[model samples]
Target: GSWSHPQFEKSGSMTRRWYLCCSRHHLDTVPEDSDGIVVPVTEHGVATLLPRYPETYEVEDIVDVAKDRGLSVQALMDFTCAGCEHLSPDGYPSLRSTLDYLASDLEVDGVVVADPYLVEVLATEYDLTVVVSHTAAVDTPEKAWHFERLGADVITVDPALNSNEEEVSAIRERVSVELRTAVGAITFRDPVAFFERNLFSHATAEGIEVDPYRNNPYEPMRERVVVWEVREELFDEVFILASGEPP
Candidate 1:
């Protein structure tokens, strides 16, 4: 199976389990030989399963789909704080209550979060696995290890850390908690990097606050993000995430 790399055959007692996850749906078709899928019930204050900011799901709909796939649904609670300029205009009625429903009623397997403080809260109260988002600027081995100690089952490292083999290997060595890497996708190093280079600056250069919502500047592409060909040597020690929309 693709998930069983040669590295896994050689690892020690503390070695981690590698799972493939994507933010989009279509998880039920994942090959039987691979690890289970990651489904997003909600993210950025919207119901990805039903879009346009719905805060709830039918209990049967969530569980039947998840059980059919034999994988846990991945509930994401990575919303920007209210009033932040980057905060999307649509909002969940109560992000906390919605999350509680996913765990309590929907029974998702894991919860991914952007805030470090949310880590302990989710880890303690729910039986769900907690993953810290790479968006947290966890670019250093120190920052990666810090979240591990704080109780994140997995800490997604920044894209900036991708292609840096030495540092990636160092991160794996320094932290027993599983590590996650993102590949493929149209994006920047971080929101700050995205903002600094284009969000505000490009809008100013255009003489107006550009509305990215209605008019996406990027050309839409039909190509799917590929994850299998990623050099095994570069990621032999970590988990690979198909972070983009599937083809």
Candidate 2:
């Protein structure tokens, strides 16, 4: 999952400020039009699963295709926080109303929130694992305590400012939750120290000359899962294998 390899981009350096990491399934949702909210078709009024149809391909569909192609797969719930009075049509568009849409559309083993408001304001519940890696909102160490309050199932640390190992170890010892190790480098630099449990990376194919994530338009959550796979463990699931045959 490292940059500059066969799977990574090596054309040239990318701007650090605007750099982005993502899961391979980005295009399934988050369509450009804010007004035209994409309502994925589902059975009995529930977007419970990714549609097998190409016209309605979504998270579930993308992962299924990845597995079918012998690629890795993971579900993602990318949400944004409401900074002010922005509401649905014109207000601050957030995932507050998408909880049922998410919970019903896909079954996930884990969830990551980039906005603290998702874990805070959404109020809705999810059955899968939850990670409060929200970057912009939570900055202080005390917020870890808040994660406890919101029932965060796991936590992640961005490598840029995270240097206090003792504090991290202390947190790990204090809470029985999965730690995301560190993020920054596209490749796993320390398999033994970091990916003790596993490496989870979300990569992108957005571009080859610029940010590797820009190599493709559908990239999302590709950074975490790939990092996990770098630890030598194999990724597998029925959707990935797709042995049921075409309908």
Candidate 3:
């Protein structure tokens, strides 16, 4: 509520927490590692409206291509991929092929989605580097335990899920894996900016190579990385271009 300046109130959105900060007509006023990127939690939003991917099933065809291209090939182990109410049809075992192939070919970590199924699969099936809760669709303290037991390496913080700073900290306290805070509202922005604030960068998914690493679904803190959310056109360049406030 402290950060909710008079200007923000006009938008019908309030500063859920005090650590929250964003640059507008003026330069960034908050520190880079601001405390409350997501201070207050909202009860509902677009997650309920997510239109699942109709044909979004895993078929690891280009193992060699992914490897040869040296691209960061992370999997979206998500039920959303299969559309509404559709979990991985083949379950974790079906993902073995893709995981195996990626391990051998592509330069990427696994993108274990938040359907909760991914937590079990990644722990038993393959050696996953990251396990992100891909969507901000659901955020609660309960999911934190699921991430730890499953042995995930990272957890991505989704803004859309309306996650609160305290709930975020609770999740951080439970899991040993890293956290990837999705600061950007869409693709143009760097999702990592959300976590760059340092209150929880230690909770990222996994430390993938290159600049933008993906967070595991179970992680509560991390080293920080940026990926996904970009291709979806959900965020803008300002999220990244804005940069964090200085010390």
Candidate 4:
């Protein structure tokens, strides 16, 4: 999101630097430790519960609540789980369909997209601030640069890319666009992005897989726990994205 808003603070007496963006379901749990939040929107509408609960809410209430709290709020259209049978018949959300909702009605600071292709359209056509080049799709510096060229406002790097400090330094040293990084609880570090793609799928399922994943804090919280601890210098010029749901 653009910091063009007059009151947007960078480092005030409170000195807000790192920002927290979570699903609106967890908005009540957000500690006074953040500057903004990203409310989740699903095909069924504002993401409340899938599988067992299936209940959803309006985003306006969350928007008002966020305004009252003096924190920025953004809409998160997460079709990342479209690959699973729970949300769709084909296990893939129509990228264009999600964009239609956001562009047509949703108004917010920006959009955090899991789909890199949506990144280009949102930034260019919708003229909305777009955050892209995430680890899931753009783990490499080359991949990140591609999105930057595509007009992404922020290019995020995964913690896995930090394994090679020199490379991270190289990537950091060269690319443009605000470099965003993630930090949080983590379990297994999956080599292929399939681990996360699958984890997200089963987590939102009502089937047998849900039994093992539901309420299982060990996996979802399992995030950049290993990423932020290393290479302090690498993040000096980068913005920090504190990702993951509440404990």
| Cα lDDT computed for each candidate against the true fold | 0.50, 0.35, 0.37, 0.51
TM-score of predicted structure 2: 0.42
TM-score of each: 0.61, 0.42, 0.41, 0.62
lDDT-wise, the better of 3 and 4 is 4
| Residue-by-residue lDDT tens digits, candidate 2, 1-247 | 6555547457622211110112234333322321111122221111111223122244456545444443322233332322242444643233434555555554333445545555554334556555554232233356666675667665554332244456555655566544443222222233331321111112111111223245433234333322221111110110111112222
Query: Looking at candidate 2, what is the lDDT of residue 59?
Result: 44
Best by TM-score: 4
Using lDDT as the yardstick, the better of models 1 and 4 is: 4
Count of backbone collisions in candidate 1: 0
In candidate 1, what are the lDDT values of residues 113-173, reduced to their tens digit? 6565567667766677887754465777898888887788877666566667888788888
Cα-lDDT of candidate 4: 0.51
What pairs collide in candidate 4? 82-91, 82-92, 83-91, 185-221, 185-222, 185-223, 186-222, 186-223, 187-222
Candidate 1, residue 46: the lDDT equals 15
User: Cα RMSD for candidate 4?
Assistant: 7.8
Candidates by lDDT, descending order: 4, 1, 3, 2
For candidate 1, the TM-score is: 0.61
Q: Report lDDT (Cα) of residue 3, candidate 1.
A: 59
Q: How high is the lDDT of residue 203 in model 1?
A: 36
Residue 112, candidate 3: alpha-carbon lDDT: 38
